[PDB]
Amino acid sequence: QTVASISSGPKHTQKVPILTANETGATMPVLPSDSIETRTTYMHFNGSETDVECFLGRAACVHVTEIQNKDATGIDNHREAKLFNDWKINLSSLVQLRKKLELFTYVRFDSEYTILATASQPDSANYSSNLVVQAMYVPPGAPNPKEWDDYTWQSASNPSVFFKVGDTSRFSVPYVGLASAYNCFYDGYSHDDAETQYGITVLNHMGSMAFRIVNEHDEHKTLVKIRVYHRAKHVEAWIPRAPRALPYTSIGRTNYPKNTEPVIKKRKGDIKSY
Amino acid sequence: QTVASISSGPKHTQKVPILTANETGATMPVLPSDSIETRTTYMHFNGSETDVECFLGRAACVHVTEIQNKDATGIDNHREAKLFNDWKINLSSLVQLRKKLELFTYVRFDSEYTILATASQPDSANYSSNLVVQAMYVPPGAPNPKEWDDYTWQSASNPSVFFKVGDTSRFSVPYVGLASAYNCFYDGYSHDDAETQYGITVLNHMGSMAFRIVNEHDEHKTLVKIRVYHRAKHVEAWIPRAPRALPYTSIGRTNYPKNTEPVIKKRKGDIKSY
Amino acid sequence: TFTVINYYKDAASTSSAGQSLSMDPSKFTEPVKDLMLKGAP
Amino acid sequence: TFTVINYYKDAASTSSAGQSLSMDPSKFTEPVKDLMLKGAP
Amino acid sequence: TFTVINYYKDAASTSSAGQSLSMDPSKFTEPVKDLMLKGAP
Amino acid sequence: TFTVINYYKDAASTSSAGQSLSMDPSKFTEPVKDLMLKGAP
Amino acid sequence: GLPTTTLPGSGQFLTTDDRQSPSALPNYEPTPRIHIPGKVHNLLEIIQVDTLIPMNNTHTKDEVNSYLIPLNANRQNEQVFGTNLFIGDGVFKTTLLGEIVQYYTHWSGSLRFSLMYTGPALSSAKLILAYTPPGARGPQDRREAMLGTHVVWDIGLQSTIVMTIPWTSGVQFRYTDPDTYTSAGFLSCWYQTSLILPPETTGQVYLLSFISACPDFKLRLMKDTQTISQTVALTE
Amino acid sequence: GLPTTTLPGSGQFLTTDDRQSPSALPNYEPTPRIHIPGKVHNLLEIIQVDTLIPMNNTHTKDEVNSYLIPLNANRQNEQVFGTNLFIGDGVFKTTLLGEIVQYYTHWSGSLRFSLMYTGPALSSAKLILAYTPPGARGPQDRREAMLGTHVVWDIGLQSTIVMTIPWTSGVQFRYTDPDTYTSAGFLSCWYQTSLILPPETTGQVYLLSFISACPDFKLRLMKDTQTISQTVALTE
Amino acid sequence: GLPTTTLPGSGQFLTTDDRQSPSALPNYEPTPRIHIPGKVHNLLEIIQVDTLIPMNNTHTKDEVNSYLIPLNANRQNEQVFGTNLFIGDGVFKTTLLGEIVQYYTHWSGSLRFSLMYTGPALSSAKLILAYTPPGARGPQDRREAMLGTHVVWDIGLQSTIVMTIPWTSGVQFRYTDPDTYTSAGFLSCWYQTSLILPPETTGQVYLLSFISACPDFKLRLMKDTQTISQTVALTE
Amino acid sequence: QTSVSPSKVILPRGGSVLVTCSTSCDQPKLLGIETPLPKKELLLPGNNRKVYELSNVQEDSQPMCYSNCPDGQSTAKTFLTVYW
Questions:
Q1: In this complex, do C25 and G215 lie within 8 Å of one another by their Cβ atoms?
Q2: Which residues in chain G have Cβ-Cβ distances shorter than 8 Å to B104?
Q3: Who's near I67: CB < 8 A, 6+ residues apart?
Q4: Whole-angstrom Cα distance, residue A270 to residue G108?
């Protein structure tokens, strides 16, 4: 048992632990036993749920897209027709997860993905199709499919998972960053140029996912909604950071919208009100 | 083998074990061997089914709600439309379980939940949809979803389980009470106030469950009935209590309805009738 | 005659614990003590 | 009380690692050092 | 040649017991005893 | 390199037996014996 | 992949299976267990505590008087009370023993029956409490009653008699619900001598009857209790 | 085939299950881990760092002034500030402690409250910082305040006072969201003597208030934070 | 998750699989086993008990007379009875051996055939009981009968002859249902000398024939019995 | 106590009659009607009351409702008569 508080009686100390200098930038560990007479209590607590592995470590929906299974004859832009959809993987699009991750500067983790496909048939349909989804992980910078039945889907190298709509797929992706950790913040440019983009960098490329319904068309249209869930595991985090206070406006940037509302709540009363 | 009864012959005892004083409030363990000549028998019995773990320890339906999968376009109150439903978890709504638990003052247990979803399509439908339910455990006091596709459902922290309608989900929740045990009875208030509620307390907050059908709408309406089954395990119980005799009227209160029927059966005959 | 492997890291995930061996009703049936033998602390 | 067999060859496939035992906040709370004891390399 | 692990805590859950080795029909086929050798208790 | 647990009590339930090691065709190819060495019983 | 064969019952939800299940709150640390007095391990521990029997259940409403067995002065060879011993029914249905008993289907073991006299100190009475084992009718006279298990109780400084109802059965378990085959017999109390009240006192004095289980008590097969009912879910 | 029986919950996606899963990039070798300073193992490590409290949150907009607690010269037996101790709310909502606290439902342990004086060196002041444990109102006069936990702070060469708010509760854990039952009490600061400014100086001097957690701090049940919200997915 | 591959037959209900299954009454303690005499471990134990053969099944109804084999005085070189040895058919169908045999498809082993004489003590008779192994017709005269397995039985103080029908077959098992290939042969009884009744006695005396199995008996392949049938479910 | 309805009935030869067995016990374990007649238990909810359609009544019969309820008489006989 780890002691939380030690028994401590009256103190006529000349080594005043309660007078310090915050000018130094140190949080001296002053305990209750230093300013009040205390009893001896035990922790009964390990702090398992505050470990970064747990704090940043449950599955969160990080992308949602709808794709369709329909007659593809006579369509030029299959992407526009929502026959397939791709998505550059990023954990920045959902703000809860982004703020949690942005509590740190550098983060290293392996990715466990869960893809949930759910079918809907809004228009008249005689039955529910037994559709199969192909979720193709394309490595960073690899060509995405350009049409629904492109040969890119038959890639001999791109990892692909085939699963029924209504069911899930699960697969882990190791940490794929070039550097020893992802740069959740980058104060630099890709090169010394006057006009080049700031912050957003290729260091944090985690890949991309393409989705299509493998089935040929039925007589009716089926709408499939794909939810990608990411779970970070084997998490390592460095350099704690000031938490995000203002809304986000874009991925990879710290920008916040103009004319934002005040973060700090105003007091109902003066500074003396409880 | 544990002895139930020992062989005992005629007794001319001056230490009369059958004359006592119930004024003292003790149930002296007088045995058959004390008042009658007995033979020696064995128990052949451990009392495994009377242990509190078993007595309070099978799955019971503790909540039932119906939700719908329908076209959500042009609806202001999704909760009223039964597109989703939430429920503050409590084991008081079913009287069998409540009376069993109320046999004790303090109870500590972990919760095993089983959610059964069953679909019905009363109106004309061409097929049975392959629907997916999201059961979201929201921690005590956390915001419940306000609309069917609110971002609260995509919570990066709230535990959620996705399962097909017609199938079940199962997940355990540890004991989540603030105090060392749940207060199945609380003779107090949240604070010293003249008007504050009595009995019902936040000490016994076990969380809450929100339910929706993840699927977008089909052409027809599907009615999904969600049954939540709770099973208490690792049960610890303190301070046995007088069993409940009268009907209940509310959760968290010991109130009973006015003009209730007599509990004690009236005798068909006088006090001498067998 | 019986076997259990723990498949999950949490104690809350384990199946029911079974029977409390040491059951003794004297707590409730024989709570009387003479207060003249100074049993009180 | 708990058991894990590795079913896959990759370290990325294993479940979460658990808790970092040796947690010490002095890195962040007590980063002050006297520079007159020559702690610098 | 054969293996069984008990997956449930109850004896009623186990599979069938198998064969009663010690089978002897004399209970039914040879129940005759001379009552003049005082076999009765 | 290979493992089998018997899950059923019956020998008929086991998978195929494999290869008969001791294969010798002389039963069929060399069935000739001189009958003047009295090999007959 | 390990070759497997899914058996019948796969995917069933049996409400009594009790297997391991994944936790929704991984790494959660519950509040430590502090010492609270009166921990209950087994329900066989608490049924051994005497509770009052509403033996005088002859009133239209539930009253304290239902628990008071009237005794009358100057009654000779007369009956005080008589009841059947269906512990999960009748006068026993509401007692702690009966309540815990109604949660199970089978019961075995001995019962502890107690009587406490509440009359004035200067009164006197000898009562005979008789247990009639099953197979015979409820005794209609004291002579019939005293042929079975009985205790002659002399009321004096010890105001309480404790008679055990010994487990008296062929079959090893009885049904908690009333059944002819598993009938438990009868319990009656009679005046042995009489009740004599001192001068300046008149009226009815009362007995309190208590029921409890002996340590050899058994309860087997869990069932729902028919004591409480609901037709609608409750709210806060 | 090994005979198996699939249990309820088979095929469910529980977002917190944490099992093994096949790798999509077999044989991939990730970049080696280099030493980066400031590794964070546990969030209980970083909540122990003091951050400023916007104690003076009386402004319409967010300003640096929200962090400056005004002190006035020649005030006697008067209050400097007063706040409730709902650490996941009010003045604490935006501090590092409050931010990390809003990710959990329960909290226990002691808080470290600090004040830094920023006035001229030739000034003097004695303040009394009082913690009123729950059950009593926020103190309305210094006499009431000094009956509870308090520290008389003499401002001099050491410009910083560190008062601990000892864990003072019956229940072992409090809710991070404001609740009457799990109320944590009140924090107030009062002039012990007064503030005296040297000649040639006038106006308001300021205190900086800091909050942090003691090493005995606990946070249990993870929840979403209500600090940031989104109605639309973000893009690049 | 342990990678598995579900095999064919997954989800099938095979009525003879005999696997473990979850209990609906966890922690239930069944009544202890008391000693009851006459425990049956194996059905091969009870088929070894002789039961009567309705050898004289020449009546329109079922009568006690069906069990009485008539013997007539002053018959010479004549047949008493003759039957085929399809033990699961004919005269054997209703005997205990035949009844237990009809629950199985194959049988092997020897049969124990007994005759008990019930005539007056002062009578005399020598009979020859012949077993004709398969391949030959049922013997039509005593000479033919006595070429096979036979026993010359002299009726006297020992009123019972026990002839064994030795397992006489090429194939190791016979079908319990009548089949030409697995025919078991014939059983006949003949007068060796004659039956002589004492004076003052006249009419038919009777033999009782019993059948049972020798300890070397075998029954293999379970099947339904065609002795009892139903077209409608029964109720109470 | 066990009860039978009707107490008595006169019915044509070969006709059907509905006989009701009831108990005072709310939860009886054994409850039925003893009769040599062909009978059919009517699908009815509950434990303490049963209804039987006794078909093809040919003679005077005395169907007895029976139960294991220990209150009062555990059996009750009804009297069927035939007219032809």
A1: yes
A2: 40
A3: I52, I53, I54, I55, I56, I208, I209
A4: 73
Please count the structural domains in chain E. 1
| Centroid of chain to Cα F1 | 24
Using DSSP, state whether B254 is helix, strand or coil: coil
Is C32 close to B110, i.e. CB distance below 8 A?
no
Q: Which residue does chain G place closest to A57, by CA atoms?
A: G26
E to F contact (≥3 Cβ pairs closer than 8 Å): yes
Burial class of D30 by CB neighbour count within 10 A (0 to 12, 13 to 18, 19+) = middle
Residue J36 identity:
P
Place of tokens 């019905």: B120
Q: Could you say which DSSP state residue B55 is in? A: H
Q: For chain E, percent helix, then strand, then coil, each to nearest 5?
A: 25, 0, 75
Contacts of residue H23, Cβ cutoff 8 Å, sequence gap at least 6: A171, A172, A173, A174, D8, D10, D12, D13
User: Reduced to 3 states, what is the DSSP secondary structure of residue I46?
Assistant: coil
Asked if residue H8 lies in contact with residue B170, where contact means CB atoms within 8 angstroms, the answer is: yes
Contact A46 G29 (CB under 8 A): yes
G16·I7 Cβ contact <8 A: no
Core vs surface per residue H21-56: b (16+ CB within 10 A) or e: bbbbbeeeebeeeeeeebbbbbbbbbbbbbbbbbbb
Experimental method: cryo-EM
Q: In the numeric block, which tokens belong to residue G28?
A: 């959660």
Q: How many CB atoms lie within 10 A of CB A222?
A: 22
Report the chain I residue with the minimal C-alpha distance to residue B43: I32
Boundaries of domain holding C2: 1-41
Question: How many C-alpha atoms does J43 have within 13 Å on its Cβ side?
Answer: 0
Distance CA B178, CA B175 (A): 9
Tell me, in Å, the resolution of the deposited structure. Answer: 2.4
- Say how far apart CA B96 and CA B91 lie, in whole Å: 10
B5, G216 contact by CB (below 8 A): yes
Instruction: Give the bridge partners for A223, in sequence order.
Output: A68, A120
> What are the start-end ranges of the E strands in I10-97?
51-52, 68-71, 79-84
Q: For chain J, what are the domain ranges?
A: 1-84
Chain B contacts of A99, Cβ < 8 Å?
none
d(CA G228, CA B244): 8
| DSSP structure string for H18-64 | -----BSSTT--PPPPPP-SSEESBTTTTTTS-EE------SSS--G
- Distance of alpha carbon G187 from alpha carbon G128, whole angstroms: 11
Expressed as residue numbers, the domain containing I111 is 1-236
3-state secondary structure of E37: helix
Q: How far apart are CA B214 and CA I60, in angstroms?
A: 76
Residue that is written with structure tokens 């107030």 in the block: H188
| β-strands H79-84, H174-175 pairing | unpaired
Q: Are I130 and I149 in contact (CB under 8 A)?
A: yes
Two tokens, residue H49: 């760092």
Q: Please tell me the total count of domains within chain G.
A: 1
Question: Where do runs of H (alpha helix) occur along J7-77?
Answer: none
Measure the CA–CA gap between H29 and D11, rounded to whole angstroms: 10
Total count of domains within chain A: 1
What residues of D are in contact with residue H30 (Cβ under 8 Å)?
A: 12
- Residues sharing a CB contact under 8 Å with residue A67, sequence separation 6 or more, in sequence order: A82, A83, A84, A85, A133, A211, A212, A213, A224, A226
Cβ neighbors of I187 (< 8 A, separation 6 or more) are I82, I83, I84, I85, I113, I129, I130, I131, I132, I165
